[PDB]
Design a protein around this ligand. Structure first.
Ligand SMILES: NC(=O)c1ccc[n+]([C@@H]2O[C@H](COP(=O)([O-])OP(=O)(O)OC[C@H]3O[C@@H](n4cnc5c(N)ncnc54)[C@H](O)[C@@H]3O)[C@@H](O)[C@H]2O)c1
Ligand SMILES: NC(=O)c1ccc[n+]([C@@H]2O[C@H](COP(=O)([O-])OP(=O)(O)OC[C@H]3O[C@@H](n4cnc5c(N)ncnc54)[C@H](O)[C@@H]3O)[C@@H](O)[C@H]2O)c1
Ligand SMILES: NC(=O)c1ccc[n+]([C@@H]2O[C@H](COP(=O)([O-])OP(=O)(O)OC[C@H]3O[C@@H](n4cnc5c(N)ncnc54)[C@H](O)[C@@H]3O)[C@@H](O)[C@H]2O)c1
Ligand SMILES: NC(=O)c1ccc[n+]([C@@H]2O[C@H](COP(=O)([O-])OP(=O)(O)OC[C@H]3O[C@@H](n4cnc5c(N)ncnc54)[C@H](O)[C@@H]3O)[C@@H](O)[C@H]2O)c1
Ligand code: NA
Ligand code: NA
Ligand code: NA
Ligand code: NA
Lengths: 463, 468, 464, 468
């Protein structure tokens, strides 16, 4: 009998195995990676603590890691993003997973802690992270442990106080110097996403980052496919499943026109919305305008749009006074980060009426309502199924190569994968979708000053 | 004390009511119709038997009819299109409904018959039909009642055998002349969809149509919105929910480029597929080409597309030989009619592996597999939630007007036993009811400009011939 | 030894012939019509007076008609739409053609009259028309001719004054009963466009239409291809050649969301504009909103848009008061009809500065300026080359069949459209060139949906 | 009588002046730079040699440079790209320009020579280059100079034996050592385009770069706007004007899916073509596939496509083998560089029939034909008017600021003989200068938000490695 998991319903494993099988066919990067490195066992001896959305696509990553030799513990990095049948399938395969769709904030953090008590004793020795929560627990616990503890009493939001409480409990409960023990053994962290990657650079900049980091996010085959086309597919999926609204004839507002805002704007415009965009970056604003989006402030958009999406990575994008101005039954959601793009906390003393999981109606004192999706957390993973498998194969092939890099083939800074590996990720996905790549003849290669086998662009190229 | 319904779980009534409320906001035509005709109760005394997908949108239509005075009994017109919280909410309102997502074919036809056993006794006096099943139940039983029973005594499909078995049962279990009783009481039928309306015209053409009919499908504000923009939103919704597959990068094939096929190809193109189309009609073919779609035969597309959608209203579109030639894990689905656009019957010797409701993996002798959605029945309603509310407001406002026309505006017998469409002024009225909700500001003709183009300021703005 | 033509530069004939050759490859339907009916000579004995934009595409139509046996005289139906090399090539082939890019309204009407003095004597016996001007001349002279002359003293625009002056002239120069003679000789008219078909239906409904007519515009394979895709390709072509502005990032306003408005909005949207639309028709307005266009009034748009396009066929769409509100150097143009969708007349006392042909900058007293294309006439024909040949093959195959119907093939003095099987046939004639492979119904399947295997496939009310 | 210009016609100056005035309104970035820097005269003493298409847009740049203090000499960097009326207006402004649409290759290089004889003797001190021709002139002459000359006697193309026999003539005709004189006085070069800049990078890498250089092509507000959106607007413009062909229904083939190829595919797809794409870079191939383009080889496309566009910057993309396999009257054109993307030389003995300027019909032994635009040279500038003004305003505001950096802000010598880019804050400023004209309203970061994402409120908002 296996005891060391927490999932909604183990019986869901066969359903999860079915969808994993279908996903494998859609993830050639991952499957080709298994066949290349399976034989070579480059992660043999890895103990990978994984904190990343426990979806069907992540199950395929997990078993890739396990096929490369890795020993695994896993949690979701979001309280609503777990796909319970994926988690059930992993648990039934003997991998400790602690992931429930709709976990509480306290459970979310307790489970993250569980990643570091390895089965058979000891710590992890690699972190695979999305949004940086597992890395942040290690760093906060290490800093409290070095003696700097007043910060844990700093008042904050609810989640922030749960986190401080968790660090206090681990310090009270684990042996002296537990966090230093973990920090010592972690050989590297690979980070999936823009927000978490920004945290890593700020810590590398303060000299406060405890082990090397590979920025998986800014592989070109991650940032310009997952963040862009992922969201182009999965944002409108989230909105439709949450609300079933007609998008043709609607006005949508997207805050942010980075990779996620571009894909989000595109998702809504392809689905038939007339899209407006806000930006603080004049180059990205000019991109939006050249794509035919009206570029406006949120104050301008607030009374006009039918649908609002935050896509910034920033905080306080849609505020109480915007929502006060919205039309009755405007739809509001977040595809960027955490839950602070929208001022969710300032809504908690209005009447919330739950419609169904991750769909709520919020009523203002003047009787106008808004429809809030996933309580302001990632809408594509919360209200639907996240990005489809194929584009996740790109991102997760990057993740697997990043773990191989950090556990085998780096100083205490933040690195990207070499461009020939990035190009390799692309190559692995072309045959599945029928691309026939041309090859430079040698004189054509020489003419533009590249090798026939690449890299084809300088490190500065932006695609 | 109410037990005259059959639904999956009456406990989903509260969830259903919440989505119904959300849908009212998205259905201005239906709600304005309640406001305008509510106080006039134009449907008082009406007994409307509805056979139309039991969705949240249909629930708003049903409550609009009752707001106008109608007594109602309802069933879904597909075994997989019921939205069980919508059914629950209607049954909890006291309205007889017999609608379950995943009902069997035998259950399906028995529920249709239950439409005609009015509560308190008697029959309906109106039919609101989608796809013509309730209308066909009356006409077939009437024909058999007349002594022309030959056709029952062997069918052609399984459903044709269940269906004829029903007719036989009703001839024995219902009183003598019951189908003539019904046909006598029915004052009209309004019919929702292309396939069902074609049946009506053929029956009218042969002089077998037993009561006046309004073709709601071919209102402009139905066929060029519902069939076109409805499918554009709901086709990939259903493919996404069933498979979670990445559409960008994939080749899709759509059979048909009528209104549904146009909306279905846009759905897949707008989602990022490279879309090819088949057609038999040279005009529709050339439209597909001019919109940038490659126009090929199914035989051409069979070995190369990732996704197949039938959208023809015809049969035998995707055959066993096509599916044999398909790449492994190709997705096959139908958004047109019945379940014989795809030869589903030809697959029933193969290993089916159920993935989840309405998603099956079918494995061929050569180990090649295909992914079948909703067993070949309407994918948008079976795998997702059908069209969204706002465009169904247009369809269903037309339905309501048509019900008013045949029930309350036929004292002079303006509607004979033929198939009619609503007048243009009503069709424009449907459009006008939906403009303010989406922020459209309409221009008003100046008097001079109105005279200049030969129209009244209040419309109608186009000849009856105009194709939009 | 011909001089029965008027063209700007007959030395452009070789160049027109080269582009005619190129267009023939692009016009499968016209060419297959030549091939199929040529040996039938169904137009032998026809004398076709054509009034239709003298473009390269129209040259291929004219030579198709001649190849089916027609005798021909031709003019352009718009003063800026002639392509001078196409006119030179038709003149050089020996066919009377009176068409110059930039002809004046006075010349325009003098040339239309030249249609009716048939070479070798007599009158024409068919009319192929676009916008109805040749038809209108016959009807006006015929009405005045039998006595009601008073309307000729009441012109309501300067073009009407020129047209009425022409009628007076003819009635005095030409033999008595001349218009009654023409009217008797005309066996039919086929009419290209929405506006001209508007004119026929109202003459028919009033019982003043003098001969039978075929509404070619409302072939499916015309209105839902030419009016729609044609404008989609050629509206932005005209705006780019006249202004060379960047379209990405600009706001455009299209008045009307009929077929032309639909195509025009798509032209500007596809080019990169954020497009707003006006409509009086709630159904067309709802279509626009559902295709993602903001549907506003002209008054809402006037201070906002960078580009304005009238596509209504109505009058007084863009007024002096709208133009006074426009931002400086807004671009204004018409793709609908005549020049009364924009109040061009009202700008006649502002300072006009010609930039180049069909491009003018108009200064208001407050010094704000607007860019006017083609003096508010058809911008795709005025500033560029009209629709491209392939879509025009569809319209002109319909023209050619309508000429055959009325001349060789029952037709009362009403307005008729071609039978659906001919409409389908037009579409078939264009599939192989663009690589379409049509599916053939099995008898099985045809029987199931209620059609003959060979069509037609749709009821006559089907809207496509 | 100022005598020093070579144009097609001086009498076109007024028409050029009318369109320059129109273009200023469309070029808020250049005008803003004029107003802000005019008073500061940051380029008094500058003597800029410019080699860059003599278009209406270039004329506004030239006058901008002139307004900031510059003495100027100009040539076009393509034989067909000159807009004769712009040239005439510049000449009439008193500026030495030598540019004719349809100049010879021998005149082109002799004009490029006329650049370095500064009026009143002496040399330029600034090079503003598109393609690096005037740059390589200095460099190929300088190398020639103190030693190596064996490369001059080794041709390549016809435009390379002409280029070498020109280098021969200056060595001969100028004072001995004059190429060193020029490389001496040149404070810097700014380079407009991808092909030019890589040649700068190949040379700074070799240690043979003779003066500082700003890579203007890789400000974000050039490469991601001009290369992309410029070709999206002007590719189909060139093709329409050259051929008047219907694009809806046609298949187009685009070699390359860098910035120009992305722009080019979009231009054709938005105009109604079904677009196929070739690539050698697996990442750009994957981007095309994800945008819905079929990605194939040129051998696959050659018999299929109606329209071919080269967009690679590389040579031998379309060879005699491909063109032999094309369908009759296929359209072939190039928007990348030079005229060696298409093997034009392989057509040199076939029948060419000139349709009109920059449009030729080429007939093969088998009587099949292709239509070649601008003889294989840049189709958007040869057959139409190049990129529109608004997007050249972004490129040319970068050019202007690059000329200010190398001439005015190099006193500390912060620019050595390497290839630099402008600072991101200046790149951001170019973008800001174009927002108000197109009605963009920018949001302002509050300080806590700026801290949160790790940026100053005033920018730069992205890291130097960010890809947009
Ligand atoms: N839901 C998903 O599946 C998914 C996928 C990828 C990335 N992400 C997340 O999305 C967020 C954004 O990622 P990205 O890759 O687009 O980052 P990015 O840096 O590429 O883009 C962020 C944009 O936000 C803009 N911005 C910042 N503050 C703004 C404000 N107040 N108003 C308007 N715009 C503002 C910035 O100018 C920037 O251009 C992050 O939280 C990231 O981790 C989510
Ligand atoms: N799923 C939905 O929500 C929804 C919505 C509206 C209508 N419908 C149904 O969808 C079907 C189609 O409706 P429509 O309004 O588009 O009708 P239509 O008459 O407008 O279009 C059907 C098209 O299929 C083409 N066709 C017929 N046989 C073909 C074949 N063997 N191969 C390829 N093409 C063929 C026809 O030429 C025709 O253009 C009908 O059964 C209708 O009832 C479904
Ligand atoms: N330039 C071309 O090549 C070209 C091609 C085809 C037709 N046309 C012409 O274009 C005009 C329109 O043709 P159509 O086929 O689209 O006709 P249509 O009947 O299909 O469309 C006209 C539309 O204008 C709308 N309208 C009328 N007055 C309006 C107003 N004041 N404000 C806003 N909308 C108004 C109508 O409601 C209608 O939908 C006609 O003059 C026709 O002859 C030109
Ligand atoms: N006409 C214009 O207005 C204009 C504007 C900007 C740039 N350009 C020119 O266009 C060319 C391309 O510029 P860019 O910015 O796109 O550079 P880029 O580096 O961004 O893109 C070029 C692409 O071509 C691909 N490639 C190279 N050889 C190939 C082959 N044999 N087959 C298929 N793909 C191949 C490369 O992989 C690369 O992705 C350059 O010559 C540049 O100077 C022209
Ligand atoms: Na997914
Ligand atoms: Na729905
Ligand atoms: Na043309
Ligand atoms: Na230009």
């Amino acid at each position: 009998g296996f005891t060391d998991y927490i999932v909604k319903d183990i019986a869901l494993a066969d359903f999860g195995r079915k969808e994993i099988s279908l996903a494998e066919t859609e993830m050639p990067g991952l499957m080709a990676t298994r066949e290349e490195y399976g034989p070579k066992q480059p992660l043999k001896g890895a103990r990978i603590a994984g904190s990343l959305h426990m979806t069907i696509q992540t199950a395929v990553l997990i078993e890739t890691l396990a096929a490369l030799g890795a020993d695994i513990r896993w949690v979701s990095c979001n309280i609503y993003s777990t796909q319970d049948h994926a988690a059930a399938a992993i648990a039934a395969a003997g991998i400790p997973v602690f992931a429930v769709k709709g976990e509480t904030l306290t459970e979310y953090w307790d489970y993250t802690a569980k990643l570091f008590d390895w089965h058979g004793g000891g710590t992890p020795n690699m972190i695979l992270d999305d949004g940086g929560d597992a890395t942040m627990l290690v760093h906060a616990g290490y800093r409290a442990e070095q003696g700097d503890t007043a910060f844990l009493d700093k008042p904050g939001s609810e989640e922030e106080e749960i986190f401080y409480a968790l660090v206090k409990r681990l310090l009270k409960e684990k042996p002296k110097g537990w966090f230093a023990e973990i920090a010592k053994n972690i050989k590297g962290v690979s980070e999936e996403t823009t927000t978490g990657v920004h945290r890593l650079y700020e810590m590398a900049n303060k000299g406060t980052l405890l082990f090397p980091a590979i920025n998986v996010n800014d592989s070109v085959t991650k940032s310009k496919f997952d963040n862009l086309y992922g969201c182009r597919e999965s944002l409108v999926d989230g909105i439709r499943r949450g609300t079933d609204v007609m998008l043709s004839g609607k006005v949508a507002m997207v805050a942010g026109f980075g990779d996620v805002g571009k894909g989000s704007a595109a998702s809504l415009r392809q689905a038939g919305c007339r899209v407006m965009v806000s930006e603080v970056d004049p180059i990205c604003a000019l991109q939006a305008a050249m794509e035919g989006y009206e570029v406006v402030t949120m104050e301008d958009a607030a009374p006009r749009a039918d649908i609002f999406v935050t896509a910034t990575g920033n905080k306080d994008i849609i505020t109480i006074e915007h929502m006060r101005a919205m039309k009755d039954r405007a739809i509001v959601c977040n595809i960027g980060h955490f839950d602070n793009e929208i001022q969710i906390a300032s809504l908690r003393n209005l009447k919330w009426t739950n419609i169904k999981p991750q769909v709520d109606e919020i009523e203002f004192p003047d009787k106008h309502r808004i429809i809030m999706l996933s309580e302001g957390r990632l809408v594509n993973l919360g209200n639907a199924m996240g990005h489809p498998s194929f584009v996740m194969s790109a991102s997760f092939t990057n993740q697997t190569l990043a773990q191989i890099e950090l556990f085998a083939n780096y100083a205490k800074k933040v690195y990207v994968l070499p461009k020939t590996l990035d190009e390799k990720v692309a190559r692995l996905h072309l045959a599945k979708i029928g691309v026939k790549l041309t090859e430079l003849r040698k004189d054509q290669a020489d003419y533009i000053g590249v090798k026939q086998e690449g890299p084809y662009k300088s490190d500065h190229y932006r695609y």
